[PDB]
Amino acid sequence: DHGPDPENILPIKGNRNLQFIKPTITNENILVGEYSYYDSKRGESFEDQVLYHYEVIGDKLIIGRFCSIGPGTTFIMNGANHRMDGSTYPFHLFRMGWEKYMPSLKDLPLKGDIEIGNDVWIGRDVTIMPGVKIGDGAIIAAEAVVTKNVAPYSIVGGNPLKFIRKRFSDGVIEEWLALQWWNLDMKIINENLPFIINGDIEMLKRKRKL
Amino acid sequence: HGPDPENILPIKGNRNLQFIKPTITNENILVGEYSYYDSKRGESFEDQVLYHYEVIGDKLIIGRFCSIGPGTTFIMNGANHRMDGSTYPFHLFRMGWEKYMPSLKDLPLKGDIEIGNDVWIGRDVTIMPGVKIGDGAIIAAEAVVTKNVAPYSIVGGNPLKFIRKRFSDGVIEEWLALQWWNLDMKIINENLPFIINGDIEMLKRKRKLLD
Amino acid sequence: HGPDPENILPIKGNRNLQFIKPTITNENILVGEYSYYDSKRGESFEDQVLYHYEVIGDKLIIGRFCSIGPGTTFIMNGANHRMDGSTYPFHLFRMGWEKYMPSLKDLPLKGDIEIGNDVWIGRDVTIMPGVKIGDGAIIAAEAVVTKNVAPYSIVGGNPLKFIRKRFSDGVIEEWLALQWWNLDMKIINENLPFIINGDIEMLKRKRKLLD
Numbered sequence: 001d002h003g004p005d006p007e008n009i010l011p012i013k014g015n016r017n018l019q020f021i022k023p024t025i026t027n028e029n030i031l032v033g034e035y036s037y038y039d040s041k042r043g044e045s046f047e048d049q050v051l052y053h054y055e056v057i058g059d060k061l062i063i064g065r066f067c068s069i070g071p072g073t074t075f076i077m078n079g080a081n082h083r084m085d086g087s088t089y090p091f092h093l094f095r096m097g098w099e100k101y102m103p104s105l106k107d108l109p110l111k112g113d114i115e116i117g118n119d120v121w122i123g124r125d126v127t128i129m130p131g132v133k134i135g136d137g138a139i140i141a142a143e144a145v146v147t148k149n150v151a152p153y154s155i156v157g158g159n160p161l162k163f164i165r166k167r168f169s170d171g172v173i174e175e176w177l178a179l180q181w182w183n184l185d186m187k188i189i190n191e192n193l194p195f196i197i198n199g200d201i202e203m204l205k206r207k208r209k210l
Numbered sequence: 211h212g213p214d215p216e217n218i219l220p221i222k223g224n225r226n227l228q229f230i231k232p233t234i235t236n237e238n239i240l241v242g243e244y245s246y247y248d249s250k251r252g253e254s255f256e257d258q259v260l261y262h263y264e265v266i267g268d269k270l271i272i273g274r275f276c277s278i279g280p281g282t283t284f285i286m287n288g289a290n291h292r293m294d295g296s297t298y299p300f301h302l303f304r305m306g307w308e309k310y311m312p313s314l315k316d317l318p319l320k321g322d323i324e325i326g327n328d329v330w331i332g333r334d335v336t337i338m339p340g341v342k343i344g345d346g347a348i349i350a351a352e353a354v355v356t357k358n359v360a361p362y363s364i365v366g367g368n369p370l371k372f373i374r375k376r377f378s379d380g381v382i383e384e385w386l387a388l389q390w391w392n393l394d395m396k397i398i399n400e401n402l403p404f405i406i407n408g409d410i411e412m413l414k415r416k417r418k419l420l421d
Numbered sequence: 422h423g424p425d426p427e428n429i430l431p432i433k434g435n436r437n438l439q440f441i442k443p444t445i446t447n448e449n450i451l452v453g454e455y456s457y458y459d460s461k462r463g464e465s466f467e468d469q470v471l472y473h474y475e476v477i478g479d480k481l482i483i484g485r486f487c488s489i490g491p492g493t494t495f496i497m498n499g500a501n502h503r504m505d506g507s508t509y510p511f512h513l514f515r516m517g518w519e520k521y522m523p524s525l526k527d528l529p530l531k532g533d534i535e536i537g538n539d540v541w542i543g544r545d546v547t548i549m550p551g552v553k554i555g556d557g558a559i560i561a562a563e564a565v566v567t568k569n570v571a572p573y574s575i576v577g578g579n580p581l582k583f584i585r586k587r588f589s590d591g592v593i594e595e596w597l598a599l600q601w602w603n604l605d606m607k608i609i610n611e612n613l614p615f616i617i618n619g620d621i622e623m624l625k626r627k628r629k630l631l632d
């Protein structure tokens with residue numbers, strides 16, 4: 001039964017910055033898998049990096065397992081976008097008679113949920129824009145502004161987002177996607193950790209036989 | 211009808227969102243009514259204006275009904291070093307080096323930052339010296355504005371990239387001719403439904419011009 | 422004449438601008454005289470050097486007379502994860518996982534960060550591992566330096582883009598042959614007017630004189 005307790009908020013002794021995300025969550029519509037961590041700058045909670053997240057819009061932030069999320073990473077949800085049909089000025093916010101110009105959901109340029117897969121490495125000070133989907137095993141370069149979807153096992157960076165490269169061949173990627181090591185039982189993961197780390201996919205497929 | 215533009219904190223229970231105009235204390239900054247800054251921590255809009263020096267005499271001008279996102283910063287002309295030879299600012303250190311004080315003519319001055327009306331500036335935008343941003347423009351979050359921005363266009367990136375024009379050229383000229391932001395508030399209130407949904411055709415009719 | 426390069430705070434009223442070299446307490450950080458960091462709040466230059474681990478042994482090297490803007494950060498080689506398989510750093514959590522501590526040969530190490538002399542680094546610049554920046558370069562504000570920078574060039578953006586060369590190739594070669602930053606301070610002072618106003622012809626005649 002090796003490995004840390006995923007219910008541990010601070011799984012590293014002496015370290016007051018790095019947090020397992022899941023057991024810190026208190027707000028709704030934030031769904032984060034076990035072992036995924038946030039390496040905070042100064043002890044701030046992961047939740048406070050999630051911005052413009054309003055119940056009435058009801059968009060969700062979804063993050064898988066074994067993700068590495070760097071310090072200062074922020075998640076921009078759908079509340080951040082104004083109506084763009086005419087004036088972008090949010091008259092309704094100021095009330096005093098203007099509250100009747102409250103936008104309907106259909107009026108807003110909603111983009112849907114932010115969905116981050118498993119085993120994703122997000123660099124320092126990354127900004128994630130509304131509705132973005134990030135595939136399994138992707139790597140987001142430091143200081144990136146993720147303005148569009150990211151394919152699984154690809155490396156991207158920049159502002160706006162640029163494609164850097166695929167981590168592996170298309171065939172190897174499909175093998176990792178078929179395997180889904182993150183969904184294996186922890187006992188199986190533990191026994192297979194050397195191959196998960198060194199990327200020996202062919203070996204994992206053999207252990208795959210049972 | 212509508213809020214008081216002289217009220218610093220026009221949203222009940224909100225201590226971050228400020229009407230900018232009544233917070234201005236400095237010369238060489240002009241901001242139009244109803245334009246607001248949604249601060250991160252309650253910092254003032256003036257705290258976001260950097261390298262702005264009286265001796266340089268550059269100005270920051272912002273129109274009416276602008277939306278300015280958290281952490282937006284305005285870089286004025288004091289930020290640039292002399293570039294004819296070494297960029298090192300010897301004069302700062304005195305002890306004999308003060309006689310190398312630069313002339314304003316020796317500096318790469320870019321002029322005023324001028325932002326139009328009904329402009330929406332995203333979170334954490336950086337605006338570089340001498341930039342002009344036209345009416346109705348939209349600046350994407352985290353953008354670094356390094357060149358002028360055409361009216362009613364959307365832009366973003368570092369360096370700044372053109373994303374798209376919001377409307378057709380003909381429509382844009384209609385908005386620029388209309389200038390609803392300069393109308394009396396009584397007339398604005400009457401036309402708010404169309405100002406908001408962009409029914410420029412109704413707005414034209416409602417104006418009742420010498421057609 | 423000029424300030425004492427051992428003075429941490431060489432400007433009288435100023436609590437933010439620090440000469441870097443005398444503040445350095447760490448190993449593997451080598452910074453030349455007169456190079457300064459104009460801090461945001463008051464932090465130290467070393468606070469801006471991140472993921473710098475003795476076990477990696479990489480070095481941050483900065484020449485003389487560099488101007489480093491506020492919020493500039495230096496990302497050392499400790500910031501990169503192993504990329505052969507999962508990027509997840511199991512070893513950090515121990516409880517049995519300490520066995521999987523990665524070795525140096527399994528890491529994507531990029532080498533030392535090396536910044537030349539007379540380099541101007543703008544506000545809020547990020548410097549990635551293994552980057553080399555040549556003498557006299559200028560790094561635009563908010564840039565993310567993702568690759569090497571030629572001497573006497575201007576670059577900016579995220580990722581980094583080439584803007585332009587500061588001078589003609591012939592002039593750049595003359596500045597590089599000159600290396601004024603390496604001359605004795607008596608000679609520096611004597612030639613400060615020409616170093617500052619970019620009179621490279623004069624500097625060249627002066628150099629030929631005592632060669």
Ligand SMILES: CC(=O)SCCNC(=O)CCNC(=O)[C@H](O)C(C)(C)COP(=O)(O)OP(=O)(O)OC[C@H]1O[C@@H](n2cnc3c(N)ncnc32)[C@H](O)[C@@H]1OP(=O)(O)O
Nearest residue numbers: 039068069070122123124141142157158164500567568580
């Ligand atoms: C959760 C945590 O604990 S996170 C911890 C904190 N650590 C970090 O933030 C570090 C994150 N790491 C990075 O950003 C790294 O630089 C990585 C992942 C991009 C390294 O990728 P590598 O493949 O090793 O980069 P490499 O140096 O080969 O560059 C690859 C290409 O992309 C370009 N590139 C590099 N960085 C960027 C970028 N940020 N944006 C766009 N392109 C970039 C390079 O120029 C190169 O292209 P070229 O060959 O055409 O020039």
Ligand SMILES: CC(=O)SCCNC(=O)CCNC(=O)[C@H](O)C(C)(C)COP(=O)(O)OP(=O)(O)OC[C@H]1O[C@@H](n2cnc3c(N)ncnc32)[C@H](O)[C@@H]1OP(=O)(O)O
Nearest residue numbers: 080147148160248277278279331332333350351366367373
């Ligand atoms: C004052 C206040 O209250 S501010 C409140 C805080 N809110 C904010 O900061 C949010 C501001 N909004 C944004 O930045 C949004 O992303 C907007 C305005 C750019 C949305 O633009 P949309 O028209 O919806 O564009 P959409 O998302 O479809 O993308 C359009 C293009 O822009 C590209 N794009 C998106 N973001 C950027 C960017 N930041 N830089 C460059 N290009 C971008 C997209 O890739 C797409 O290009 P493509 O079709 O070639 O891929």
Ligand SMILES: CC(=O)SCCNC(=O)CCNC(=O)[C@H](O)C(C)(C)COP(=O)(O)OP(=O)(O)OC[C@H]1O[C@@H](n2cnc3c(N)ncnc32)[C@H](O)[C@@H]1OP(=O)(O)O
Nearest residue numbers: 289356357369459488489490542543544561562577578584
């Ligand atoms: C240590 C200290 O004390 S630092 C103090 C803080 N000061 C700073 O941070 C300011 C540093 N200065 C800058 O960033 C300046 O904008 C400079 C040095 C890049 C300007 O260089 P310049 O040659 O003046 O000017 P210029 O303004 O002419 O622009 C030339 C090109 O650069 C482009 N450009 C400007 N900024 C950027 C940028 N940040 N990234 C990429 N391109 C840029 C411009 O668009 C233009 O390109 P184009 O011709 O393709 O349109």
Ligand SMILES: [Cl-]
Nearest residue numbers: 259260261262
């Ligand atoms: Cl300032």
Ligand SMILES: [Cl-]
Nearest residue numbers: 320321322323
């Ligand atoms: Cl001007």
Ligand code: NA
Nearest residue numbers: 159368579580
């Ligand atoms: Na860019």
